[PDB]
Amino acid sequence: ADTIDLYDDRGKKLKGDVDLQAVSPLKNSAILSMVNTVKRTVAVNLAGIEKACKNASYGGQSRNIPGREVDIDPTAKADKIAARVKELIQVEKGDDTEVTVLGGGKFLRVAAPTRRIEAGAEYVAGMTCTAAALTEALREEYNLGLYDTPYVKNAVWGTYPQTMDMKGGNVLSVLSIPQNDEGLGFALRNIMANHLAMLSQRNAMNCAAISSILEHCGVFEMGQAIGLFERYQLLALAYQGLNANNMVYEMTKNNGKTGTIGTVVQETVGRALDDGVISVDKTMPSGYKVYKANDVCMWNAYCAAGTMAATMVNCGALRGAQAVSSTLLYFNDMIEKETSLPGCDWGRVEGTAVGFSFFSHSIYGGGGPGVFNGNHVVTRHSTGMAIPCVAVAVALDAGTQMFSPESTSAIVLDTFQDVPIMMNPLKEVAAAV
Amino acid sequence: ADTIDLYDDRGKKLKGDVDLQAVSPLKNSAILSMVNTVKRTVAVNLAGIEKACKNASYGGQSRNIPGREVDIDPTAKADKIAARVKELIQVEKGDDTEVTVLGGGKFLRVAAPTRRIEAGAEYVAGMTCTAAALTEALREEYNLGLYDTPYVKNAVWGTYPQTMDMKGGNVLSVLSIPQNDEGLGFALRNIMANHLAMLSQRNAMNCAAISSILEHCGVFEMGQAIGLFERYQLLALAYQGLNANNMVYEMTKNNGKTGTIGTVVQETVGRALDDGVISVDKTMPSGYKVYKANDVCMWNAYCAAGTMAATMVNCGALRGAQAVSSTLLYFNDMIEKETSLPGCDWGRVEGTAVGFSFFSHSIYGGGGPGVFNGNHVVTRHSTGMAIPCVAVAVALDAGTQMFSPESTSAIVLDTFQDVPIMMNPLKEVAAAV
Amino acid sequence: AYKYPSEKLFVEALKSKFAGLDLSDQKVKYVRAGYLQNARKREFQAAGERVAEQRGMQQYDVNVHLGGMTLGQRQLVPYKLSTRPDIVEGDDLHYVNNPAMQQMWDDMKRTIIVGMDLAHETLEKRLGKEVTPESIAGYMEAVNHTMPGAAIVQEHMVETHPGLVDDCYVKMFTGDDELADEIDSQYVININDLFDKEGQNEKLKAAIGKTTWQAVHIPTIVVRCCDGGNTSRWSAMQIGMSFIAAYNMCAGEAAVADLAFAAKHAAAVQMAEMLPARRARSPNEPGGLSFGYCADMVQTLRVKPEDPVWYTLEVVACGTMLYDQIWLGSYMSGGVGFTQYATAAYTNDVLDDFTYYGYDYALNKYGDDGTAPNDLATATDLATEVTLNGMECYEDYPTLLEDHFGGSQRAGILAAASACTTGIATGNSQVALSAWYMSMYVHKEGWGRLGFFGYDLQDQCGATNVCSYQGDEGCCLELRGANYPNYAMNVGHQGEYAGFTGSAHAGAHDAYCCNPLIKVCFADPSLVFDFSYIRKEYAKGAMRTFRPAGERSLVIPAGV
Amino acid sequence: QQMWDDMKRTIIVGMDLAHETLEKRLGKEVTPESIAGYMEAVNHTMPGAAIVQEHMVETHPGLVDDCYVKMFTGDDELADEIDSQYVININDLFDKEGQNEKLKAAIGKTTWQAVHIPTIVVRCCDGGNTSRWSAMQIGMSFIAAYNMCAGEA
Amino acid sequence: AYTPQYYPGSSHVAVNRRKHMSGDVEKLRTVSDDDLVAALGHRAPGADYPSTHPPLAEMGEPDCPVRQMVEPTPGAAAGDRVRYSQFTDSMYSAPSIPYFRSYYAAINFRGVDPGTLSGRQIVEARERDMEAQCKAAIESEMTCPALAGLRGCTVHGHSLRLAEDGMMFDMLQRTHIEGGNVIEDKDQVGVPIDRKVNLGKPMSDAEAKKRTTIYRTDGVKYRDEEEVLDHVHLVHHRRTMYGYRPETAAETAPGVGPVTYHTV
Ligand code: F43
Ligand code: F43
Ligand SMILES: C[C@@H](OP(=O)(O)O)[C@H](NC(=O)CCCCCCS)C(=O)O
Ligand SMILES: C[C@@H](OP(=O)(O)O)[C@H](NC(=O)CCCCCCS)C(=O)O
Ligand SMILES: O=S(=O)(O)CCS
Ligand SMILES: [Cl-]
Ligand SMILES: [Cl-]
Ligand SMILES: [Cl-]
Ligand SMILES: [Cl-]
Ligand SMILES: [Cl-]
Ligand SMILES: [K+]
Ligand code: NA
């Protein structure tokens, strides 16, 4: 069986000789808790509801319905409304429902009770029950009636149900609606990189962990971690996302002052050779050495760690997210040229990076790195070994992006800033072992 | 608080003075188990996989890929395959994974471990892990290689991932894919009436219960059972689906020899009046009496029970499913004319029935009753008070339908005929209190 | 104020269809002439003979009608476009035969509104470029060369034939009068000139603010070859090429991707969003069109706001055709389809008579436009009076009942008159919606019939869902549309809902209903279809006098 | 453009299940004569013309001249009984290397309609219109050809 | 047991509506079994009933408590096809109106699938049960054979001017007057039949107005039937109120306003 040493975000050892199965999405209680948290937690924009009602801007995108303003001030009654929402959504007193006023009354964080998720088939009960509880709380507090309550309902729910989503509404999840899934098992893959950067509070080590965990939870739900593929995926999670054996942190540190994508390639090959993961296979007439992988899944995991460290070194030097697309491409292209072994995810990180480079530097779609996610058509193709690097690059950016975490995901930061699994994911994963 | 007496499918009292909350989707362990079972259980058509491979008919719909037949016989190796599937999907020895060979080897029932659902965001992990485990089991058993395994993979998964669903595949759920949801919280609403009739083994009382339970679970996930609406929905579930106070059973018995839609209307009004649910409000000059509802949610629940009993009496007499659309329409239209009180779901059962009648008797879409479900655009509009009657009518049909339970849902019957929650839902719900 | 006259508005059309007829007669002589009575059917039969001969396979033949009878055992009667002198054969109003109706929908489908502020901020932040009226002017020239399908950066590019894409263009609009005045007027939608009544221009500029937008209209031929989902993508590609050239950017650098995301998503305002799987459709298709946006596309409100009924009924004409004839009758079904389900709402001055009657009743009882109480009691009074009067008209004039021969037509027209009266009177769309459902309930009990088998699905769900606030039930009417669950299937409702959504804002004397960007965009006279007078355009199409875009005569043979 | 429009406007629809419905529910006999009547009906109605109601308006036949329906079958005896104008002749078209026999063996003794709705319709609308348009006029044609209630279960 | 009241209103039209609902409709004519079977067009007069499935007694049934307490109709027990009758009724004071044909069926007959439309009203049922229901309707005061007729297709006519001889327009002319009587010589889907089914004399215009269930200006004016209007209003109001909140308090929620009724 495989064991790993767990190290934290500062390069400090947490636990030695941990069974690889102990960090599995199917077994580690901290990971299971992370998934439950992202499913059941929603953010409420009370300030947005108040503006929509006062300005009759229901649905957003410059909509204005003249004469249909509703003059209510929920930000000034945030504590009363929060208490009513909690009473309406809680299943039993003392259950895990939480409703907290943030931003001096501008927002609520609503952790809907787990039981409402359990009683359903998907994850949407948090969104639906919060929107319903808010609508009722506003109707009661402001004595709304037959013909104005519908407008307030649209301030909360947006254009639902004319649209499948609460478009222009004021209830937010880090997940999207199920109908946006590209395929089977994609809901946990559909987390905007800008959101991931805010969950991590721009700590790039914690970013790698949060993003890698959720990506691999998705891969497991897709049915793509069965049999031999379970070890393949778990080693990638551990070495790329969980700083196993301190490889990501130490390779970044070693290359952080003068290193480049290429020096990280070199250190990764040297480590694989020194650790027995690869060996010289044959030598060509020129002297070029063809390598062989003695442990195929472990060679991939080393490439995954190298891809992450290269992102941290290159995007960290740029203090800019955009270089992540070329870093994933050239780390893997060049490590193949250096060894004659296939790179991370057997070309699928490189391929993802090719299209991601194109779609972050062209007219045709995409955007900056913060708009991508594991469900995006451009960036879905690797089983979890590309997006964590994207999220890390978004976190390292010092201000070069137009669609930035602060401009698209501000409420996510406030909602998860004091949530322990997001504040210290590596410590919580290790403590759950 | 409200209490109900629970009665079984033969009109015998099971439990007295049960708190209405104890039959809630959020609280009753049998309901919660039913939801878990439908989410995580899949049927495998091993005979279909064998036929697709031997005939190169991958993807169905008369497809044939000449030359790409793969000659494998999984129905003859069903026990070995089943054991391998179990080993590949089980998370821990002794967990709730089940794999059972059915039909002499033609089919498997696979109950994927609940932990795989818990670790994901939706319910699809059963379908995906089963499809993956099967593909691997066949590859191993039959020594498949690089260029033929892809074809066998399509025998299992259908045309996925060119399509979003496993179209033409051989892994089946009573649920559909999440992207087929019409809106938020609709996954448990997307259960074909023919499937519900097979879950119940054509026991119409048990069909009412199974369908009503799952419909209201969906309504709860939609956020439409919050506050006062929780009592509204729970009373409809109890009185229409769980035979509360034996009202559905007794009204059907009382009207079963010579009764009609209209006599059931009359008995429902008389019961509401005798039980104090409604009272005379005012009398018109002609002597026509306008009634008033003393308990609005209870009056709805009585109308829901009457709509169900009227279906049992009218479709039971016809021994034909098609009359359910007119029964739901005319029961509710005439009870309004009889009382000047609004009918079941305040017109939404009647309205559903208007469009359902149209789309079960016209050129434009729909079909016979068996093709409808709570997620169907035609039949989604009532919050759970129409589809259970549809499923009951499908169960009562003696052979008038072209798209019948036996022709569309045969594998569902074999998969669930030994599953306790589907064999005796009313007894299991009462025992869980 | 308006005064309802002594002669019903529908009498002229009856007299023009039936010269010399005693309009009180309940009986008629049937001659059973069959199709030969009718010039259009005879022309169709001859066309079918040529089709069959040319392709070697039978097609149209009136004698294939069942029962040994051809169409026209009764008299086949033509249709007067309401408020117009044009009387046309019924087939001339089938969407397939009517290019004006086709081009109205193509003009909506090929339009996207795209903000410019985010793109300009991107250029400033990432490249340090200064955006000026001069740089914007260069961009507007670039985008009007590239948008129809022509090249600006690469060498050896092939291009669209400019004559095939002559309808494609881009204009900008803004609430900033200073910017609007600096750009060449050929590139600008002039809000002040177009919205010169009742201070509408100031209302629009206040709502839009000092923000800048592009109204993009991609080529008709493209949406005809493809779908409405092409529109925002096509727009974004050529916006991006134009920014590259006009700001000397690298032709493909990271900042270009921010422009792409802005133009495709963040600053893009679709006409319609996507639909769920059973009716899967791309964006910019009719099922996603909200009633508020439909009402805002129609422009009679900027021409004559002092007559709220006229604008209201032009919206009805726009919506009933699009939603019933093209959307429900084609996209969602097909065949002969649903022409007369919709013509009932825009021909023979019938809905006009019933609605002006109601307007006069409300003016006299409740007072000026938009001042009536916004309550269920008022909806009840107006709907009942308007519906009873209309039913009495159908009872007293036999040839009126024979015009709206299907109960569904009668139901939609009586309920539209009821709800439009209530909208104008109260100024409230949601109260008008209660009046709509009340009309249907009143109608059903009077005659013991309503519409087709499945007409009142939404009807019977209707009253209780007006004031629901539950997730998939509650919604203000302006934001409802053809995907509101109860509305997703049936003829005889969707275009009428758009009509009385317009009526409520016309009664309130607003400049728009839902989105001021939509309102300005569709006011532009450079569109092919004249959104200011819907029924006049339909008449041109029916008379073969409407020239649509998108034809391929430039690139096809002809010959004997 | 026309290559794509020819693909988008095409749907293939089996006839066996429809015929089984008529037999089971109505007790109708399906014969080469009843199929021939159905093929005439569907080629009148498919382009957008009326067969049941009175006072219907219709598409201009010249605007929809590309719309038609043919049947095809691996049953050579049925194919031979229907007027050739309505039938795709597999044996004439697939005369090389025994291709006709391979196609007929794969299809079997099942019957299919190749429906091609009007180009002008998919140009005004989208490819989603195709299977729906096809089904509406198939339905109208069965109603007429088998003397059904024009709207029964 | 509860005594039904069926429907409000005090005019003779409301009385007629309660007659149709309660099934207390006078028999006015006789139609032989063979004539009616010929008109319906589903089988030859005297022929055995075709079956869609075997008789219940022969094939057995699932162990269902509902099947075991609900008696099948004769046609269901026998396995008959589900067939239909369909009627069209003139808005010029025909005795019947579509919804009230459907209520007559739903209240007074077992195992029926009625459908209401503006220009047609259908009853589907097992063939022999459908025949009995159609016989009851066609022999009764619910039928004038000039103002109403069997039309399984091509139904246009309910809303049209009557012909000069008082017959409702039928594009297929399945009926005509001979010697004062209405003769049907085609089946309900327009196929000629080898007999003349004599449906007897049309009602006089005065008799039709005495027997009609329709409100219109030349009979009982709808505007004057204040009890029916009150009923409509009460149902709409209560539906609106309870969709907002299903409780008595909703009946006076803001937005209701000063609702008022004529007779209550
Ligand atoms: C602006 C981009 C970035 C982007 O997102 N798309 C562009 C431009 C876009 C535009 C150019 C239209 C115009 O000239 O105004 C269009 C036609 C798409 C559109 N918007 O309609 C296009 N490219 Ni490009 N584009 C092409 C190609 C190419 C080749 C051209 C290399 C050369 O040596 O000429 C290179 C990529 C590469 O190096 O591999 C290329 C780049 C680029 N392509 C660079 C601009 C290059 C430049 O500055 O000259 N295209 C091709 O390689 C062939 C097909 C050709 C496409 C037109 C056609 O198929 O007819 C066109 C496809
Ligand atoms: C076969 C159906 C069942 C169904 O699913 N659709 C039908 C037929 C369908 C066909 C008829 C075309 C043809 O004649 O070949 C089309 C045009 C749809 C299509 N496939 O293109 C249509 N109906 Ni219908 N259908 C209509 C209507 C109606 C009215 C007609 C009643 C009368 O008194 O004439 C009744 C419903 C009712 O009673 O309320 C009706 C029924 C029916 N409708 C009955 C046939 C009735 C008959 O046997 O005569 N339609 C209308 O009420 C007006 C609009 C009209 C539609 C065409 C248009 O909008 O121009 C047409 C809409
Ligand atoms: C990536 C995605 O764009 P978004 O990132 O969603 O804007 C997608 N475009 C494309 O895939 C464009 C493909 C055609 C142009 C490039 C050809 S190499 C689309 O519009 O749905
Ligand atoms: C119900 C549904 O059909 P299906 O049951 O999915 O076949 C749907 N049709 C419609 O809603 C037809 C609408 C237009 C024709 C009837 C207008 S009243 C559709 O094709 O997606
Ligand atoms: O007769 S139906 O109401 O089903 C269709 C009318 S077009
Ligand atoms: Cl394995
Ligand atoms: Cl290995
Ligand atoms: Cl509440
Ligand atoms: Cl005559
Ligand atoms: Cl109450
Ligand atoms: K198109
Ligand atoms: Na030319």
What does the block give as tokens for E146?
């000039």
State CA C344 to chain mean position distance.
15
The H or E element that residue A386 is part of is none
Q: Label the pairing between strands A98-102 and A107-111.
A: antiparallel
Q: How far apart are CA B7 and CA B5, in angstroms?
A: 7
E window 10-49, beta carbon within 8 A of B: 10, 14, 21
Residue D85's closest CA among D63, D109, D68, D105? D68
Amino acid in the structure at residue E261: Y
Nearest to B308 by CA among B231, B252, B379: B252
- How many C-beta neighbours within 10 Å does residue E192 have? 10
**Which residues 6+ apart lie within 8 Å of A100 measured at CB?**
A82, A108, A109
Interface contacts (D, E; CB < 8 Å) = 42
Residues 37-56 of D with CB under 8 A from C: 40-41, 43-52, 54-56
Closest ligand 3 atom to Cα of A366: 5
- Assign 3-class secondary structure to C251-305: CCCHHHHHHHHHHHHHCEECCCCCECHHHCECCCCHHHCEHHHHHHHCCHHHHCC
Any atom of ligand 5 within 6 Å of the Cβ of B362: yes
Structure tokens at A412: 């996510």
Cis peptide before B161 (omega within 30 of 0): yes
Q: At A137, which amino acid appears? A: A
Enumerate the residues of chain A whose CB falls inside 8 A of the CB of residue E244.
146, 149
Burial (0-12, 13-18, 19+ Cβ within 10 Å), B18: buried
Tokens matching residue E235: 């149902």
- Nearest to residue C65, comparing CAs of C76, C54, C56, C55? C76
Instruction: State both tokens at C20.
Output: 């010399």
d(CA A95, CA A83): 15
Query: Is residue C511 a contact partner of residue C203, using CB atoms and an 8 Å limit?
Result: yes
Q: What is the resolution of this structure in A?
A: 1.3
Half-sphere exposure of B203 (CA within 13 A, CB side): 20
The residue type at A139: R
Residue E206 token pair: 């005065």
Phi-psi region of B158 (alpha: psi -120 to 50; beta: other; left: phi over 0): left
Half-sphere exposure of C347 (CA within 13 A, CB side): 29
* Bridge pairing between strands A278-283 and E121-126: unpaired
Test A145 with E240 for CB contact under 8 angstroms.
Answer: no
The helices-and-strands tally (H runs, E runs) of chain D is 8, 3
**Using CA positions, which residue lies closest to atom 3 of ligand 3?**
A365
Q: Which residues in chain E have their CB less than 8 angstroms from residue C441's CB? A: 232, 235-236
Tokens (6 digits) for C94: 């089938």
| DSSP assignment of A191-245 | --HHHHHHHTTT-HHHHHHHHHHHHHHHHHHTT-SSTHHHHHHHHHIIIIIS-GG
Do residues C73 and C32 lie in contact, with contact meaning Cβ atoms separated by under 8 Å? yes
Q: How far, in Å, from the CA of D58 to the mean position of ligand 11?
A: 21
Whether C460 sits among the annotated catalytic residues: the reply is: no
Nearest CA to ligand 2 atom 34: E156
H helices of C147-274, where? 177-182, 191-194, 200-208, 220-225, 230-246, 254-261
Q: Are B370 and B197 in contact (CB under 8 A)?
A: yes
| C141 Cβ neighbours under 8 A, 6+ residues apart | none
Please say whether the beta carbons of A40 and A34 come within 8 A.
no
3-class DSSP state for residue A100?
strand
Confirm if D71 and D86 have CB atoms less than 8 A apart.
Answer: yes
Nearest CA in chain B to C334: B364
Per DSSP, what are the bridge partners of residue A92?
none
Q: Which residue of C has its CA nearest to E214?
A: C447
Q: Ligand 3: residues whose CB is within 6 Å?
A: A 359, 364-366, 377-378; C 233, 264
Q: Which of B173, B177, B179 to mutate to test the interface with A (most CBs of A within 10 A)?
A: B179
Cα(C309) to centroid(ligand 11), Å:
34
Cis peptide before A113 (omega within 30 of 0): no
Q: Ligand 1 pocket: which of C154, C233, C250, C256 to mutate (most atoms <8 Å of CB)? A: C154
In contact, B312 and B394? CB cutoff 8 Å: no
The subunits that touch chain A, with at least 3 C-beta pairs less than 8 Å apart, are B, C, E
**Cβ contact C375–A160 (<8 Å):** no
C-alpha A71/C-alpha B53 separation (Å) is: 66
Chain A stretch 222-281, residues whose beta carbon is closer than 8 A to a beta carbon of chain C: none
Residues B417 and B5 sit within 8 Å (Cβ to Cβ):
no
**DSSP strand pairing (B13-19 vs B3-7):** antiparallel
Residues 6+ apart with CB under 8 A from A94: none
Q: Is B17 exposed, middle or buried (0-12, 13-18, 19+ CB in 10 A)?
A: exposed
Has B364 been annotated as catalytic?
A: yes
Option in B32, B88, B89 nearest A118 (CB):
B32
Q: What is the rounded distance in angstroms from the CA atom of residue E150 to the CA atom of residue E187?
A: 8
Other Cβ atoms less than 10 A from the Cβ of E51: the count is 15
| Helices B425-432, B29-40: crossing angle, 10 deg rounding | 130
Using alpha carbons, select from B227, B399, B267 the residue that is nearest to residue B320: B399
Breakpoints of chain E, after residues (C–N > 2.5 Å): none
State the Cα–Cα distance between residues A153 and A142, nearest whole angstrom: 13
Specify burial of residue C349 (Cβ count, 10 A radius: 0-12, 13-18, 19+).
Answer: buried
3-state helix, strand, coil in chain A (%, to 5): 55, 10, 35
Cα four-point dihedral sign A169, A170, A171, A177:
positive
> 3-class SS at C87?
strand
Q: Which among B183, B352, B355 has the least Cβ separation from residue C472? A: B183
Those residues with Cβ within 8 angstroms of residue C226's Cβ, 6 or more apart along the chain or in another chain? none
Write the DSSP string, C445-479: HHHT--SSTTTTHHHHHHHHHHS--STTT---TTT
Cβ burial, residue A211 (10 Å; 0-12/13-18/19+): buried
Return the structure tokens found at C446: 């009077």
Strand order in the sheet with E113-116: E113-116, E121-126, E82-89, E148-150
Is the sign of the CA dihedral B17, B21, B24, B26 positive or negative? negative
Contact call for B290 and E70, based on CB within 8 A:
no
Facing C406 at nearest CB: one of E91, E119, E232: E119
